[PDB]
Design a protein around this ligand. Structure first.
Ligand SMILES: *[C@@H]1O[C@H](CO[C@@H]2O[C@@H](C)[C@@H](O)[C@@H](O)[C@@H]2O)[C@@H](O[C@@H]2O[C@H](CO)[C@@H](O)[C@H](O)[C@H]2NC(C)=O)[C@H](O)[C@H]1NC(C)=O
Ligand SMILES: *[C@@H]1O[C@H](CO[C@@H]2O[C@@H](C)[C@@H](O)[C@@H](O)[C@@H]2O)[C@@H](O[C@@H]2O[C@H](CO)[C@@H](O)[C@H](O)[C@H]2NC(C)=O)[C@H](O)[C@H]1NC(C)=O
Ligand SMILES: NC(=O)c1cc[n+](COC[n+]2ccccc2/C=N/O)cc1
Ligand SMILES: NC(=O)c1cc[n+](COC[n+]2ccccc2/C=N/O)cc1
Ligand SMILES: *[C@@H]1O[C@H](CO)[C@@H](O)[C@H](O)[C@H]1NC(C)=O
Ligand SMILES: *[C@@H]1O[C@H](CO)[C@@H](O)[C@H](O)[C@H]1NC(C)=O
Ligand SMILES: *[C@@H]1O[C@H](CO)[C@@H](O)[C@H](O)[C@H]1NC(C)=O
Lengths: 531, 533
């Protein structure tokens, strides 16, 4: 029997599996339990470390996906099904995965830790696009990814209560990071060189461990793709979190009042029941808003991410951040009037103004008017093509680009070394319509080297392009610098605001992550709402 | 003996004019015709009364006195400022008008242009060399009229509701002159059924107020508004603020030693005119540029409502309007207060000076409103570039005070039945004395519209003389027909959708879209909603 696939961690013995790659084999240990199953009385509770086991845990297959909604907008469509659960749903879902070179490294290898996105309501470490076999073979790193609770199971909060303190999905992530510190050396990984990287809610999640001291000692570098902890969707206040949690209880037949009896009744309901009602607790119609997200309650986050970002000292931190070219387009088909993947989505002026209230929810009429002013071309006020692109910019700037730009500028101006990118290559295999451009999430398959899979239809230059990106990411993980020692990728600074475009052409350096648009979102609009 | 062409009988009595030499030929001029009783002593602050008939012949042979007004002293002896200063003695006895007509007098009736000078409602005179009407009349065979009207406190001090200082008497001076034109211009060969008002800055704002005041609307048929509009934030003032200023002015000159409005103005009538001028600026509520102490007051009589409300609710079918701006409306005003600005250096301001300049250029807005201005006019990839900041502040002052008010007016009139033509004047005169960074400053299209480059004593280029002749032909092309186009690039009308205008310079006409559309959307659509909330 292959001794390379047998590992002893602190909890007991594991049996892995060898995987094939166009470049040779890698070792994979999938479905490693890192917590006790958060079932029954453990629902809504912080995770507890997995108790030691006898015998050999079978770590040859992905474990269950945490209970979550399944997208039904375009049934059977590749563009949406690639994000849906590809394993059975269960609350018994707190498992993690380790990929390492074959044979296992004998000297400490830098570790990449992947945190998936999905708006804190969905996601799984087992999706094909997160397959960690190509990056590990090509770049000789250890790759870890974990499952964490999403939706109500991960982020329902009755602030102050002990039965539902909130943020337990983030504590799932932290527990996995502690697991990496204690056990990754058994796989050949270096616990003193851990780089977190995540996308969308995963990137926001990464932002959060940076701003939470108990997590800060568990990693060394960070990569935030198309997400930030200061996004208007990534956190919720204590009052709004309580209201959302109490309405969910009402919608599923639970009282009132008292917090203890409410959580007890919620613990009696099948997981699928909470999933089916979780979306009817949002205060208004919206895109890019999610019911149960991290709560700012003074514990995991002692203050708002913005407050912590502005006050933090980030000397000694290296971060890689970036966005895709069209962050907003993907979200518009989930509620913006007139949008659909199956026509040109050439909306009218009335639909554009309607879409602004959906894309910028819960703001005063004056704030909405301000948005319409900045994103209108008053020489072509009614052109459908520009209106379609304008609303995509509104959603993309408000939710992704400008939060990321704000984060990058504050970190750089306060001690961090920041590298910024814009991913501008539209994959030849992309199934979404052409008007969506380079949509949210479609840089991930290149970061993980999925184009190297010969079973897929990517072009030759797209394979080289994926190899470039894997090299950038792994360089950063190894040294805090993506550059290969062209042209050079310069650091992002608050003044010069330099970033690079990532596509098939060599690196091009540009200035300003939508500087004009983001001055509105990050400088003016906050002052208007507070007055 | 006498020349019959220079003798004219008008309702008040008989007049004797003079015969002007121009390069192209002779012109008959009747300069200094009294149209009102002198507004002096007990008649100060009061509406004008028509000039009583006279026996004998009144010699209308030279410009009469300039209405009492402040004299600019920022750059003493400087050509660029002295050209606007009084060129006749100051006096309260100043209600006189001027008539230019071809020589010989027209056989058939001739359309009439009526000039209203600008000067922020505190200054100006029809006698300025750059308002010389002899060239337009000789070149285009038009009849041209201009009148003096009271400015400053003498024309616009208002204690609303009172009988002695009802306000807007300077506008009533203009209206009285317009009524004089209707009754008497035919004696000069002028057509009272074809009268086109034209004016610049406060004169353009005056023109617009006559459009919006029904008693004036029947006195003319077309309008030209150059670098000004009645809806500009400087052109009117509320009844309470007008009262506050009038009361503070009186307080600063010893009146009363508020209370009864009569005793207050009666005390004001005893003050020397210069004493009122010397204290007139101390009543402005803040340090600012482009705001003037005594301006028309929105009091329900001359203006039944605010100019914006009247513009929005007006029906303008049967009306032709010609509006426009210069290329750099804001630069001229920045040297009168904006920190870091001077005509003698490049005025490359710092960002701190830019932020300070915003409060001076956009006075009395909330801190939130000021930051909205800073957001829209800052290049966030070059936030501290001095040259960009200088240009930005110039745009900040021009759009807010001139360009966007004109655009709002042009758009509303076009959509509500009027035919609009719009221009941007983009030629910098070869003789301009202001520095290069000011570009094409406020007020420097006037000399080309009046054909001043044809003056033999001035060293304009031959190309600029052709340009002046073309511009003189466009307005006349409008006063005659309502259309600046000829009986040849064509000049299209301005509409709220396409928003087309033409550039006026040495090149042929070029059609462009949008009078700073993105910027004026902020001033005309958004910021009013913020000041309300
Ligand atoms: C493009 O489609 C949207 C959505 O319509 C759906 O998708 C279409 C491709 C087709 O499959 C329809 O049967 C689907 O309903 C259109 O927006 C809708 O328009 C209808 C009226 O036709 C209206 O009742 C719905 O409320 C609209 N829904 C949304 C989300 O806007 C849109 O008009 C289409 N635009 C075109 C034809 O270019
Ligand atoms: C440019 O000049 C302005 C105004 O100063 C005037 O013009 C100068 C050329 C010179 O003739 C001065 O004597 C004039 O007073 C400068 O701004 C002023 O600077 C002075 C001295 O620091 C200060 O006392 C005033 O308050 C300033 N006034 C303003 C309008 O801000 C400006 O600093 C000069 N910039 C240059 C040329 O670098
Ligand atoms: N639990 C639910 O019913 C539910 C319903 C809808 N969504 C939103 O999924 C649609 N969606 C899918 C992908 C990306 C964005 C979006 C919408 N964002 O607002 C989540 C959960
Ligand atoms: N009465 C006065 O002392 C007085 C002072 C200054 N001004 C204005 O003269 C300065 N100025 C002259 C020309 C153009 C603009 C400006 C300033 N605008 O705010 C008028 C009256
Ligand atoms: C993409 O791959 C699929 C495999 O199922 C194949 O059927 C299809 O023909 C490929 N597309 C192209 C354009 O070759
Ligand atoms: C002001 O006082 C005069 C007497 O000097 C008086 O005739 C007049 O009635 C008073 N004002 C008003 C508005 O009555
Ligand atoms: C220019 O004009 C001035 C006065 O306007 C005059 O004195 C002078 O003779 C003219 N020509 C030159 C070369 O200065």
């Amino acid at each position: 029997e292959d001794a390379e696939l047998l590992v002893t961690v602190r909890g007991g013995r594991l049996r892995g599996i060898r995987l094939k790659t166009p470049g040779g084999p890698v070792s994979a240990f999938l479905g490693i339990p890192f917590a006790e199953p958060p079932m029954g009385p453990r629902r809504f509770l912080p995770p507890e470390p997995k108790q030691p086991w006898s015998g050999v845990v079978d770590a040859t297959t992905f474990q269950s996906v945490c209970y979550q909604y399944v997208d039904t907008l375009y049934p059977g469509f590749e563009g949406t099904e690639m994000w849906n659960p590809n394993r059975e749903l269960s609350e018994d879902c707190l498992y993690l995965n380790v990929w390492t070179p074959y044979p296992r490294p004998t000297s400490p290898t830098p570790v990449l830790v992947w945190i998936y996105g999905g708006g804190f309501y969905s996601g799984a470490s087992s999706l094909d696009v997160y397959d960690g076999r190509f990056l590990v073979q090509a770049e000789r790193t250890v790759l870890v990814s974990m499952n964490y609770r999403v939706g109500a199971f991960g982020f329902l909060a009755l602030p102050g209560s002990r039965e539902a303190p909130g943020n337990v999905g983030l504590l799932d992530q932290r527990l996995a990071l502690q697991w990496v510190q204690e056990n990754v050396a058994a796989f050949g990984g270096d616990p003193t060189s851990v780089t977190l990287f995540g996308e969308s809610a995963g990137a926001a999640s990464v932002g959060m461990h940076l701003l939470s001291p108990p997590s800060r000692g568990l990693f060394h570098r960070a990569v935030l793709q198309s997400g930030a902890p200061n996004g208007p969707w990534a956190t919720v206040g204590m009052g709004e979190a309580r209201r959302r949690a109490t309405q969910l209880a009402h919608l599923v037949g639970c009282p009132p009042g008292n917090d203890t009896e409410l959580v007890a009744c919620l613990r009696t309901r099948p997981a699928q029941v909470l999933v089916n009602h979780e979306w009817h607790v949002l205060p208004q119609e919206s895109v890019f808003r999610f019911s149960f997200v991290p709560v700012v309650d003074g514990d995991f986050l002692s203050d708002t991410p913005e407050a912590l970002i502005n006050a933090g000292d980030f000397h000694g931190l290296q971060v890689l951040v970036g966005v895709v070219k069209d962050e907003g387009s993907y979200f518009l088909v989930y509620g913006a009037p007139g949008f659909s993947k199956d026509n040109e989505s050439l909306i009218s002026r009335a639909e554009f103004l309607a879409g602004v209230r959906v894309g910028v929810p819960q703001v005063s009429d004056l704030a909405a008017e301000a948005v319409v002013l900045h994103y209108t071309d008053w020489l072509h006020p009614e052109d459908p093509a520009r209106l379609r692109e304008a609303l995509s910019d509104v959603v993309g700037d408000h939710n992704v680009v400008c939060p990321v730009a704000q984060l990058a500028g504050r970190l750089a101006a306060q001690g961090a070394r920041v590298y910024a990118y814009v991913f501008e290559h539209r994959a030849s295999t992309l199934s979404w319509p052409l008007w969506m451009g380079v949509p949210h999430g479609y840089e991930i398959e290149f970061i993980f080297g999925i184009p190297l899979d010969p079973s897929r239809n990517y072009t030759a230059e797209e394979k080289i392009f994926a190899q470039r990106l894997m090299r950038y990411w792994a360089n950063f993980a190894r040294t805090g610098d993506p550059n290969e020692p062209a042209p050079q990728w310069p650091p992002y600074t608050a003044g010069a605001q330099q970033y690079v475009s990532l596509d098939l052409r060599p690196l091009e350096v540009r200035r300003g992550l939508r500087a004009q648009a983001c001055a509105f979102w990050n400088r003016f609009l906050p002052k208007l709402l507070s007055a």
